[PDB]
Amino acid sequence: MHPFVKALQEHFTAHQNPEKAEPMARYMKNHFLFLGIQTPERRQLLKDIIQIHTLPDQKDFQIIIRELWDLPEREFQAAALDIMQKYKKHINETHIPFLEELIVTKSWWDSVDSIVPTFLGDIFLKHPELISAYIPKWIASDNIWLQRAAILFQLKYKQKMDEELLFWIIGQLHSSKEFFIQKAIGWVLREYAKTNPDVVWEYVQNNELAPLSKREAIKHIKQNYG
Template identity: 40%
Template sequence: MGTIRFQHLQKTFEEKENPQQAKKMAAYMKHHFDFYGIQTPERRLIYKSLIAEDKKAKIMDWQLLDLAWNSPKRELHYFVCDYLKAMQSRLNYDHVPQLLTYASTNQWWDSIDHFDRILGKIADARIPQLMLDLSVSDDMWMRRIAIDHQLGEKEKTNTQLLETIILNNLGSKEFFINKAIGWSLRDYSKVNPDWVTAFITKNQKLLAPLSIREASKYL
């Protein structure tokens, strides 16, 4: 089933291909990926009914997702991310290995910033330890997932976990790590500015200027 559905999805994307826009999108993503040149609103309309169909049937078409993720076209990777987010309530810890397989390939900030929430929202007591493990990974993008996996949690944020993960990544020279640290602190500052202010003050010598600048936006 997944193969036929993928072929149909791929054909629809090809019919709507915009070479000129594809060049612009590829350039924006530093030429890491090939694009069809389809903008987000139109792209999501293409597979809106497909996702709705699977949600209603309470199924997950992993074969379709695998085929889409292994495509060289970035819009098909975005489809996988949108599909997984739509099916968030059906994801459990047994799916973590497959999700990490996706997150460890075709890596760039745009897909990673989907997987941090997808993994972070899985309701399982083992997720915090998983994130601690990822926070010391040799893979920078896995560490970014760990740092930002609690974005949007507001009062539910586990501050001890947030602090430990950030401390595990202080001193990094990686732009995407320091940006993520700043974002995670900035997001939590919306509900607990005192905690974030105290954290910045305590760790000011180790935090990158970029992290402090991002974290202080709402303080």
């Protein structure tokens, strides 16, 4: 175990709050143990360890993240994503398999909704020619979190949205009965409707979607149509 990770584990554990850990763990449907440390203090505790030990060398970067990913309490995956932000400008196409592995390990919406729109979205914005090397596999996978990755990687693209691709992806997954797929479709359409509401409205009025997906997509624009 890297010294940075041991120090972070000791420091988090010394500030654990079992009273808060119970509702925090219930909120994530008891997929994970929690220490009970909410985000403001969790980020201060991480800042303390970086100040003392310095940020790990880039050569250890994936190893540090993997070690944190393997620890039981969910705050360690959250801190791992905070650490990944510190290397953001260096994340590139060679890291897609590493991000895939993070998506399919200790999976839930909290980690995936951080990994995908920020880290993957930025990679594919610079390297759109790589989208077709990953997105078809992700849609076909049995893994709902990779399917959600295919939906959400363009979430914050605004005028760089590839509309044909977005609608093709949604069409491939529109029959899913999985809540997290139906809701991801609703989210990405709702978000894109902040940039181009007319196209989203016409899409949902003319293509099949789960009721949840349609409702979530138009809940902030429907008052402007009809």
